[PDB]
Amino acid sequence: FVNQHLCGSHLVEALYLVCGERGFFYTPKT
Amino acid sequence: FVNQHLCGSHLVEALYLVCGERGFFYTPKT
Amino acid sequence: FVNQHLCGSHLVEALYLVCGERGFFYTPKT
Amino acid sequence: FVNQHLCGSHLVEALYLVCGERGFFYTPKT
Amino acid sequence: FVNQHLCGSHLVEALYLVCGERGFFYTPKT
Amino acid sequence: FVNQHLCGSHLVEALYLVCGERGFFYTPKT
Amino acid sequence: GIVEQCCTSICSLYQLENYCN
Amino acid sequence: GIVEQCCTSICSLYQLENYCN
Amino acid sequence: GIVEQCCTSICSLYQLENYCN
Amino acid sequence: GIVEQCCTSICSLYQLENYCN
Amino acid sequence: GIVEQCCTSICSLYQLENYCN
Amino acid sequence: GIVEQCCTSICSLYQLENYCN
Ligand SMILES: [Cl-]
Ligand SMILES: [Cl-]
Ligand SMILES: [Zn+2]
Ligand SMILES: [Zn+2]
Known part of the structure; x- marks a missing residue:
């Protein structure tokens, strides 16, 4: 596939x- | 706020x- | 909850x- | 343009x- | 209608x- | 990766x- | 209304345009 | 769970908030 | 307006309710 | 086709990948 | 191309129809 | 973390699977 910048709601999409x-975790503080 | 009907990716949004x-954790059933 | 930047289609979402x-109004001219 | 079938947040998009x-106004029934 | 910047997933939306x-083609390399 | 159930604009995303x-081509039936 | 029409039936961008400010 | 509840029934932002980290 | 409050600056969901009908 | 398959049934990212340019 | 016309620059919905099949 | 890996920098879908449960 590819590598893109995925940010914000696009990242969680x-x-x-x-x-x-x-399932997944989205943990921007890390 | 209003109640939500959210399926698929709309829940994640x-x-x-x-x-x-x-951040958050997305944990569907099964 | 939180405060984020919400812009464009993400704002109206x-x-x-x-x-x-x-219902709502989205009136960027103000 | 083509006709649209748009529910929920897709209408707002x-x-x-x-x-x-x-801008626009989003005014659902009830 | 209008002219806006439409980029990335918003463009293909x-x-x-x-x-x-x-149908359509999205061909960013051009 | 997991299998997908994708309708409408979610397929394009x-x-x-x-x-x-x-890029890609989006070619629905009819 | 337009919200219901677009979802239960179909609607055009031209109809949507009526809802711009 | 919340994923199923929001989709099959309804859910509130307050319920959603329980899923924040 | 909303763009200034929420995009340029930062706003809460509560503030976004200011723009509900 | 893929548009219909993904929506009426399921499809994989690998199948989707066939539609890249 | 489209990215230049519509993202980098600015394009109308009409212009976006240029990329329909 | 994910924001650094995928937003600030660039990541593949494979890398995004790192954040699956
Ligand atoms: Cl949907
Ligand atoms: Cl963006
Ligand atoms: Zn975006
Ligand atoms: Zn949807």
């Missing part, structure tokens, strides 16, 4: 896409 | 907005 | 989230 | 695109 | 809106 | 993420 049913 | 810099 | 059935 | 800097 | 059933 | 700078 991507996480959703990628992880789906597995 | 909503979590994003609600949690901001705190 | 947030308005939609927040206002829902009430 | 479409309004955003269509109206641009003019 | 707009293409989707505008083209719909016709 | 997914294509956007997957294809990146390569």
Whole structure:
């Protein structure tokens, strides 16, 4: 596939896409 | 605020907005 | 909750989230 | 342009695109 | 309607809106 | 990766993420 | 209204345009 | 859970807030 | 206005409710 | 096609990848 | 191309139709 | 973290899987 900048809501959209049913954590403080 | 009907990626968007810099965990069933 | 920058389509998404059935106006000229 | 089938937040996105800097009002029923 | 900056996923959202059933190509390399 | 259930504009978002700078073609039936 | 029409049926960008300010 | 509840029924932002870190 | 309050500056969800009907 | 398949059934990112340029 | 026309510069919905199939 | 890896810098979908549960 590719590497892009994924930021903010676009990042969590991507996480959703990628992880789906597995679920994911979005933890910007790290 | 109003109650929400949120499916798929719309839930993740909503979590994003609600949690901001705190981030969040997305944990669907199964 | 939090305070973030909400711009463009992300702002009107947030308005939609927040206002829902009430409806909202998006009036960038002010 | 093509006709649209737009529910929920997708309607607001479409309004955003269509109206641009003019902005818009989102007024659902009830 | 209007002219705005439409970038990234927002650009392909707009293409989707505008083209719909016709389909579209998104070809950033040009 | 997980399998996807993607309708409407969500398909285009997914294509956007997957294809990146390569871009993509969106060609629905009819 | 337009919100319901776009979702239950279809609507055009031209109809949407009526909702600009 | 919340993912299913928001989609099959409704949920509030306050309920969503429980899922922040 | 909203763009200044929420995009240029920073706003809460509560402030965004200012623009509800 | 892929547009219909992803929506009526499921599809993988790998299948989606075939639609990149 | 489209990115230049619509992102870098500014484009109308009409121009975006240039990229329809 | 993710913001640095994927927003500030650039990341693949594979890297994004690092943040799946
Ligand atoms: Cl949807
Ligand atoms: Cl953006
Ligand atoms: Zn964006
Ligand atoms: Zn949707």
